[PDB]
């Protein structure tokens, strides 16, 4: 009973979370997951400021109201070579990664590692935060409040 959460640097408090190395998060789960990091889904304005500070990924993830990819450099296989916050328009499917926003993070680029999951609740899952540099933090708990996401 394990969940791996790969996380990135924070940029103006915004970061990317990928679960179990695949697109596997629903919109309801995404809000619960950010809540476990004392965070919320980013607004489009928060994501645009994060982008301006250096944030880019090559993965679709939820923000408030849309599923997006922040892009700085044009890459043919990342959001069809687009730059800026690329918004997903047409998809058959519902599960993606998520972005999260922590208001207490530093204002610009923070590439220190994440060492805690501060607001998870009691439960039976071994949740492991995996940083880009390989460092890990694990704790027994749960963050999903909707039965259909479990």
Ligand X SMILES: COC(=O)[C@@H]1[C@H](C)CCCN1S(C)(=O)=O
List, as residue ranges, the binding site for hyaluronan: 22, 59-60, 86
Q: How far is the CB of 27 from ligand X (least distance, A)?
A: 20
| 98 near ligand X, judged by CB under 6 A | no
Least Cα distance to 57 among 69, 67, 47, 46 occurs for 69
Q: How far is the CB of 93 from ligand X (least distance, A)?
A: 28
Identify the bridge partners of residue 75 per DSSP, sorted by sequence position.
Answer: 78
Per the annotation, binding residues are 22, 59-60, 86
Q: Which of 5, 8, 9, 10 binds ligand X (CB under 6 A)?
A: 10
How many angstroms separate the CA atoms of 69 and 38, rounded?
Answer: 22
Radius of gyration of the chain (CA): 15
Stretch that binds ligand X, among 20-28, 63-71, 91-99, 110-118 (CB under 6 A): 110-118
Sign of the Cα torsion 114, 116, 118, 121 reads positive
| 71 near ligand X, judged by CB under 6 A | no
Q: How far is the CB of 129 from ligand X (least distance, A)?
A: 8
Least Cα distance to 14 among 76, 45, 141, 67 occurs for 45
| 118 near ligand X, judged by CB under 6 A | yes
| 116 near ligand X, judged by CB under 6 A | yes
């Amino acid at each position: 009973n394990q969940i791996d959460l790969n996380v990135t640097c924070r940029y103006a408090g915004v970061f990317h979370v990928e679960k179990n190395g695949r697109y596997s998060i629903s919109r309801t789960e995404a809000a619960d997951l950010c809540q476990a990091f004392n965070s919320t889904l980013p607004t489009m304005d928060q994501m645009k400021l994060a982008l301006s500070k250096g944030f880019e990924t090559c993965r679709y993830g939820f923000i408030e109201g849309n599923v997006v990819i922040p892009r700085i450099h044009p890459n043919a296989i990342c959001a069809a070579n687009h730059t800026g916050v690329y918004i997903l328009v047409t998809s058959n499917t519902s599960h993606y990664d998520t972005y999260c926003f922590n208001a207490s993070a530093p204002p610009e680029e923070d590439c220190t590692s994440v060492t805690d999951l501060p607001n998870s609740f009691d439960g039976p899952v071994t949740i492991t935060i995996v940083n880009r540099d390989g460092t890990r933090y694990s704790k027994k708990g749960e963050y999903r409040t909707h039965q259909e996401d479990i």
